[PDB]
Amino acid sequence: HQDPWKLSADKPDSNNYYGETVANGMIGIISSPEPLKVKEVVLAGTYDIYKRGRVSSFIPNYNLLNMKLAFNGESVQTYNINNYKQELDMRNGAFTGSFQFKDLATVTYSYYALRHLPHCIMMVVNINTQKDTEINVENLLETPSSLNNQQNYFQNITNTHVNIPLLTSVAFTPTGRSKIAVSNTFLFDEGKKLQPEILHRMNDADMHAMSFDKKIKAGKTYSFALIGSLISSDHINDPYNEAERLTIYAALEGKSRLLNRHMQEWNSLWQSDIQVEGDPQAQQDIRSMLYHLYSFTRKSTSLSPSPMGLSGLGYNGHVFWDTEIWMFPPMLLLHPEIAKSMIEYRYQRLDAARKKAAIYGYDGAMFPWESADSGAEETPVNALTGAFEHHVTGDVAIAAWQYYLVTGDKEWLKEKGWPILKATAEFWASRVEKNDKGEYEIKNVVAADEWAENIDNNAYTNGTAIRNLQYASKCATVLGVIAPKEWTLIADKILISKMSNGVTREHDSYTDQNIKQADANLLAYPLKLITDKEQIERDLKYYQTKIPQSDTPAMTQAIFSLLYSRLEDSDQAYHWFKDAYQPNLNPPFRVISECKGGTNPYFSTGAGGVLQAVIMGFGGLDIDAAGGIKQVKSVLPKNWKKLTITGIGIEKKTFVLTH
């Protein structure tokens, strides 16, 4: 099960199964262990009050691919199939199930979140029978209990050439905030006169279905497709009509043209790749990390991923610094247009950040700890991160400057980077307090180490304020605008303190407490405020054992790996690489949970960190403060013969590393 392009599971065990996701950055479909079913469907950009946190959330959506297959009236069940296998093809995000029904027939089904059509899904079903047989096929549209006020429709769209039967539902999110429409059709090869008659049943309040029968002859394969479109009032004013329009459009494009477009967009994503010689498990794991980041982002949008991307309702679908510092850097090096969408998300929410700053008594733009539709603060009120974890503003500034460093797009810096950098620098200039000694303090925050609450002069927070102020000043210079000279004066005097052993102090109350995640070590990478290798090493030695095994998220060990790679320590770098994700895995597809032994995949934030350990750590790739991508000294794991990284920077460079 160590194909470098395919994740595979034989006989899914429903008692120990964590589904995999196919997604196009707009819709995510999470697999079921049951044949011809999906577990959960998530639509990006649709938020309403729902369950966790009493704040906006992603909403479980229509399981629009759900199918029932019968042979001569006998429904497919666990007890009557064999050689049941699932496979995820990471080359094209195809999720395939295959099984034999008794000794009678073989069934394959592949489904796709179409890469070029953000709101369109397709499942292709192939049935090969060894004897004459009749199939009954049903597609069910069950309204999930997350939605209300549903309506269940069915109609025929016809002309002299086609009969497109549409199974449509329209429903609302819990508070009525968003109207959802879904529209499904069956595609046949045999043409209007010979295609099966489609029946419609509405037997339940929350479910309707379309169905057909088809005679298949011995030794013949019968193929059909299910196309679905899923869209909301967050995406279009009239989702009901747009869903039916899209499904009609996709039906008359046809399966071939749809899969060809899908393949072309996936081929383009995989022009940036990471190849490992000598470690098939690492090769597959790293492909899975790239696959999930590619599936959970979309170029040419203003979409940003949640910590769980489109794998479910993890962290309510909210956007955190998990994007800017964890998922954004590897995407900026491999596909700058993905990074551009992530920062566009923030640019279009700058108004909401100015409003938050004003409500909390500050100048400029104060980005929220958790962001959703509006860009207003969305953190559950019971979590003190929302009111007090202020480094997110610096994290947004850092990503915006990095975008310009890697692309050199000065028109983007004028139109979007500078508005962000100027407003965020104005925030920090208003956020600091000058003390007796002329130093600048940032008092009463929640640390990057979120176990440290309502403390002063957090190392990471203060570091992000310094970088935000420096980068805003640098930006002003590049564009020929005059920056307040106070920004540089403040940056040079923001407190970063050492304990008596010379170790960077996490905050003013810090001695030897356990910490949730990397904080002081982040001043070495990503901030590069600490470059002295002896300082980097003494900070690693003091803090690396401060992170407990339990209830600590995957936002630490990838940084330890990267820093040990920069120190040219192969044994420590590889130890921390494995520790970053292997103890977090869930079967049968090695999806990644947030914490060690956790059960909440897929934590895309964790994948983003590990990709930095591979690209920036083992590959030595670095955003040069002066612009572009440079390469610094690195080591490989002992057992890696070659590391090849393709599509890096706007010159699309290939880097090869060997021992």
If one asks whether residue 351 binds a second copy (CB under 8 A), the answer comes out as no
Specify the residue, 386 or 620, whose C-beta has the smaller distance to a second copy: 386
Please list every residue from 444 through 483 that binds a second copy, using CB under 8 A: 444, 453-454
430-435: long-range pairs with CB below 8 Å, 24+? 430/357, 430/362, 430/363, 430/364, 431/362, 431/390, 431/465, 432/465, 432/490, 432/494
Return d(Cα 624, Cα 631) in angstroms, integer.
Answer: 9
**Closest approach of a second copy to the CB of residue 200, in Å:** 5
619-658 residues in contact with a second copy (CB under 8 A) are none
3 state DSSP class of 369: coil
Q: Is 384 in the site for a second copy (CB under 8 A)?
A: yes
- State in angstroms the smallest separation of the CB of 566 from a second copy: 37
By C-beta, is 208 or 416 nearer to a second copy?
208
Query: Is 235 near a second copy (CB under 8 A)?
Result: yes
Catalytic residue among 242, 324, 506, 594: 594
Task: Give min distance, CB of 562 to a second copy, in A.
Answer: 33
Is 385 known as a binding-site position?
Answer: yes
Residue 516 labelled as part of a binding site: yes
**Does 285 carry a binding-site annotation?**
no
Query: Residue 639 CB, nearest distance to a second copy (Å)?
Result: 37
The Cα 591–Cα 109 span in angstroms is 22
What is the smallest separation between the CB atom of 331 and a second copy, expressed in angstroms?
A: 28
Q: What gap in Å lies between CA 124 and CA 389, rounded to an integer?
A: 47
User: Which candidate, 123, 237, 247, places its Cα nearest to that of 182?
Assistant: 247
Nearer to a second copy, 267 or 454 (CB): 454
Q: Is 515 in the site for a second copy (CB under 8 A)?
A: no
Helices 391-407 and 459-479, packing angle to 10 deg:
40
CA-CA-CA-CA torsion for 156, 158, 162, 166, nearest 10 degrees? -20
Using the rule CB under 8 A, which residue among 16, 82, 151, 221 binds a second copy?
A: 151
Q: Determine if 508 is a binding residue for a second copy (CB under 8 A).
A: no
Q: Where are the alpha helices (DSSP H) in 155-279?
A: 239-269
- Please, is 165 exposed, middle or buried when counting C-beta atoms within 10 Å of its C-beta (0-12, 13-18, 19+)? buried
Catalytic member of 40, 389, 450, 506 = 450
# residues near a second copy by CB under 8 A:
79
| Span interacting with a second copy, options 86-94, 248-256, 462-470, 506-514, rule CB under 8 A | 248-256
Residue closest to 114 by CA, chosen among 54, 173, 163, 65: 65
Instruction: Reply yes or no on whether 244 is catalytic.
Output: no
Question: Given the complex with a second copy, which of 4 and 174 has the nearer CB atom?
Answer: 174
Of 35-43, 129-137, 386-394, 463-471, which segment contacts a second copy by CB under 8 A?
386-394
Stretch near a second copy under the rule CB under 8 A, chosen from 234-242, 484-492, 604-612, 646-654 = 234-242
Whose Cβ is closer to a second copy: residue 235's or residue 507's?
Answer: 235
Binding to a second copy, residues 8-27 (CB under 8 A)? 15
Helix (H, G, I), strand (E, B) or coil at 581: helix
The CA-to-CA distance between both ends of the chain, in Å, stands at 28
Q: What secondary structure letter does DSSP report for 307?
A: T
Is 20 catalytic? The answer is no
Between residues 393 and 521, which has the closer beta carbon with respect to a second copy? 393
Walk across the sheet containing 27-31 and list its strands.
21-23, 27-31, 38-43
Label residue 145 exposed, middle or buried (CB < 10 Å: 0-12, 13-18, 19+).
exposed
103, 145, 194, 534: which one binds a second copy (CB under 8 A): 145
From residue 103 to residue 142, the character string flagging contacts with a second copy as x (rule: CB under 8 A) and all else as - is -------------xxxx-----------------------
In sequence order, the β-bridge partners of residue 81 are: 101
Task: Please tell me the distance from the alpha carbon of residue 622 to that of residue 615, in angstroms, as a whole number.
Answer: 9
Contacting a second copy within 40-59 (CB under 8 A): 49-56
* Binding of residue 159 to a second copy (CB under 8 A): yes
**Three-class DSSP labels, 620-648:** CEEECCCCCEEECCCCCCCCCCEEEEEEE
CA-CA distance, 522 to 31, in Å (whole number)?
Answer: 36
The interface with a second copy within residues 558-617 (CB under 8 A) comprises none
Q: Is 78 in the site for a second copy (CB under 8 A)?
A: no
CB of 349 to a second copy, least distance (A): 11
321 labeled binding residue: yes
Among 70, 104, 263, 376, binds a second copy (CB under 8 A): 376
DSSP symbol at 413: I
DSSP letters for 103-156: TTEEEEEEEEE-SS-TTEEEEEEEEEESS-EEEEEEEEEEPPTT-EEEEEEEEE
**Least Cβ distance, residue 224 to a second copy (angstroms):** 18
CB 473 within 8 A of CB 426: no
Strands 440-441, 67-71: parallel, antiparallel or unpaired by DSSP? unpaired
Stretch that binds a second copy, among 231-239, 395-403, 521-529, 532-540 (CB under 8 A): 231-239
Q: Which is nearer to a second copy, 87 or 378 (CB)?
A: 378
Q: Check if the beta carbon of residue 198 is closer than 8 Å to that of residue 29.
A: no
Q: Which is nearer to a second copy, 595 or 645 (CB)?
A: 595
- C-beta of 56: minimal distance to a second copy in Å? 7
> Does residue 218 interact with a second copy by CB under 8 A?
no
Task: Answer yes or no whether residue 181 interacts with a second copy by CB under 8 A.
Answer: no
Q: Does residue 322 have a known ligand-binding role?
A: yes
Instruction: Please pick, from the candidates 132, 238, 532, 571, the single residue that binds a second copy as defined by CB under 8 A.
Output: 238
Q: How many CB atoms lie within 10 A of CB 182?
A: 29
Q: Which residues are annotated as a binding site?
A: 52, 321-322, 369-370, 385, 450-451, 516-517, 551
Which active-site residues does the annotation give? 450, 594
Q: Which residues are annotated as a binding site for beta-D-glucose?
A: 52, 321-322, 369-370, 385, 450-451, 516-517, 551
